[PDB]
């Protein structure tokens, strides 16, 4: 009552996303944006 | 009906013509094909 209601808590408008992490999979592995259900990469076994 | 009658013979009341009313109701011939977003996004045909 003694000037306590005036003080509002300044909510940081940027919520802290605890579970955020730079995707190590997407960095170490290649990312091929594609338009299809299936992606066929040709991987030559060898034998030449 | 058209009556014949005679010279000096009283005239009976002929039946009045009848009217018929055809109620042509409207009915929705709907098509509700639940296509997946998979087909639309993957295919280059633009299946929509």
Coordinates of C-alpha atoms in Angstrom, one line a residue:
Chain A
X1 CA 0.0 0.0 0.0
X2 CA 2.8 2.4 0.8
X3 CA 3.9 3.0 -2.7
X4 CA 4.4 -0.7 -3.4
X5 CA 1.8 -1.1 -6.1
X6 CA 3.4 1.7 -8.1
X7 CA 6.6 -0.4 -8.6
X8 CA 5.9 -2.7 -11.6
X9 CA 8.3 -5.6 -12.3
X10 CA 10.0 -4.9 -15.6
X11 CA 9.5 -8.2 -17.5
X12 CA 12.3 -8.7 -20.0
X13 CA 10.3 -8.9 -23.2
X14 CA 12.9 -11.4 -24.7
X15 CA 12.0 -14.8 -23.1
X16 CA 15.1 -16.8 -22.3
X17 CA 14.9 -20.1 -24.3
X18 CA 16.8 -22.5 -22.1
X19 CA 17.0 -25.3 -24.7
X20 CA 18.6 -23.2 -27.4
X21 CA 21.7 -24.4 -29.1
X22 CA 23.4 -24.0 -32.5
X23 CA 22.6 -27.2 -34.3
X24 CA 25.8 -29.1 -34.4
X25 CA 24.3 -31.6 -36.8
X26 CA 23.4 -28.9 -39.4
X27 CA 27.0 -27.5 -39.1
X28 CA 29.1 -30.7 -39.2
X29 CA 26.8 -32.3 -41.8
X30 CA 25.8 -30.8 -45.2
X31 CA 22.4 -29.3 -45.6
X32 CA 20.7 -29.9 -49.0
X33 CA 17.4 -27.9 -49.3
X34 CA 15.4 -30.0 -51.7
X35 CA 11.9 -30.2 -53.2
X36 CA 10.9 -33.9 -53.2
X37 CA 9.8 -36.7 -50.9
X38 CA 13.0 -38.6 -51.5
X39 CA 16.5 -37.4 -52.2
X40 CA 18.9 -39.7 -54.1
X41 CA 22.5 -38.9 -53.7
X42 CA 24.8 -41.1 -55.9
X43 CA 27.7 -42.5 -54.0
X44 CA 30.2 -44.3 -56.2
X45 CA 31.5 -47.4 -54.3
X46 CA 34.6 -47.6 -56.5
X47 CA 36.2 -50.5 -58.3
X48 CA 37.9 -48.4 -61.0
Chain B
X1 CA -63.5 -27.8 -69.3
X2 CA -65.5 -26.1 -72.0
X3 CA -69.2 -26.9 -71.9
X4 CA -71.6 -26.9 -74.9
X5 CA -75.0 -25.8 -73.7
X6 CA -78.0 -24.9 -75.9
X7 CA -80.3 -22.2 -77.0
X8 CA -82.3 -21.3 -74.0
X9 CA -80.5 -23.7 -71.6
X10 CA -78.7 -22.5 -68.5
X11 CA -75.0 -22.5 -68.2
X12 CA -73.2 -24.6 -65.6
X13 CA -70.0 -23.5 -63.9
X14 CA -67.0 -24.9 -65.8
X15 CA -64.0 -26.1 -63.8
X16 CA -61.3 -23.5 -63.6
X17 CA -57.8 -24.4 -64.9
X18 CA -55.4 -25.8 -62.4
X19 CA -51.9 -24.6 -61.6
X20 CA -49.0 -26.8 -60.6
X21 CA -45.8 -25.8 -58.7
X22 CA -42.5 -27.6 -59.1
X23 CA -40.2 -27.0 -56.2
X24 CA -36.7 -27.3 -57.7
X25 CA -34.6 -27.4 -54.6
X26 CA -30.9 -26.5 -54.7
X27 CA -28.5 -29.1 -53.2
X28 CA -24.7 -28.7 -52.8
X29 CA -22.7 -31.2 -54.8
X30 CA -19.6 -30.8 -52.7
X31 CA -16.1 -32.1 -53.2
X32 CA -13.9 -32.3 -50.1
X33 CA -10.6 -34.0 -51.1
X34 CA -8.2 -34.2 -48.2
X35 CA -4.9 -33.9 -49.9
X36 CA -1.7 -33.9 -47.8
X37 CA 0.6 -31.0 -47.7
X38 CA 3.3 -33.5 -48.5
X39 CA 2.1 -34.0 -52.1
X40 CA 1.7 -30.3 -52.7
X41 CA 5.1 -29.3 -51.3
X42 CA 7.1 -32.3 -52.7
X43 CA 5.7 -32.6 -56.2
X44 CA 6.6 -30.2 -59.0
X45 CA 3.3 -30.8 -60.7
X46 CA 1.5 -28.2 -58.5
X47 CA -1.2 -30.8 -57.7
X48 CA -3.6 -28.2 -56.4

